[PDB]
């Protein structure tokens, strides 16, 4: 038996990297509030977390959609609770004609009890990430 969290952490993944961009938002709650990292920056503007199906599609759109995000994981923390677990991803991405962004973290899920994701959070900040020029 898989727990409600690993199974939605994988799957958010797997949704990732096929641009299913529809079935992304179904792995969420309404209420949700990713947080990737904690603290302000241009993936998360106030610093607070994006939240909200409407204001995480926008972001999908904004940074996902076009900038082929692949995300990698390298090693799994599970909690004594099922519905919440740690991963550690190596996350890359490719924009601005095919420049290249990638950066390691531990990143924190969260399901409520119907197993929706309600919680992301990335522990990262710039010093991390590493750019590319092909
Ligand atoms: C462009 C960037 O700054 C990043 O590549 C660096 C951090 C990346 C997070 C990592 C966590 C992740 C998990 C998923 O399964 C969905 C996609 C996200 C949110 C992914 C989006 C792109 C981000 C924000
Ligand atoms: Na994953």
Same mark, same amino acid.
């Given at each position: ?11 958010? &993944? ?9 079935? *992304?938002?179904?792995?969420? +709650? $309404? #209420?949700? %509030?990713?947080? =990737? ?11 607070? &977390? ?9 972001? *999908?759109?904004?940074?996902? +959609? $076009? #900038?082929? %995000?692949?995300? =990698? ?34 990143? =924190? ?26």
């Amino acid at each position: 038996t898989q727990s409600p969290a690993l199974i939605a952490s994988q799957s958010l &993944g797997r949704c990732t990297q096929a641009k299913d961009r529809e079935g *992304w938002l179904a792995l969420m +709650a $309404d #209420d949700v %509030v990713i947080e =990737t990292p904690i603290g302000k920056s241009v993936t998360n503007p106030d610093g607070s &977390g994006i939240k909200g199906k409407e204001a995480v599609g926008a972001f *999908w759109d904004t940074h996902i +959609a $076009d #900038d082929r %995000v692949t995300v =990698t994981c390298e090693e799994t923390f599970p909690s004594s609770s099922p519905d919440e677990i740690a991963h550690i991803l190596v996350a890359h991405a490719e924009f601005d004609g095919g420049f290249t962004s990638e950066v390691r973290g531990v990143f =924190t899920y969260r399901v409520n009890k119907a197993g929706l994701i309600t919680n992301l959070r990335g522990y990262y900040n710039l010093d991390m990430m590493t750019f590319g020029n092909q």
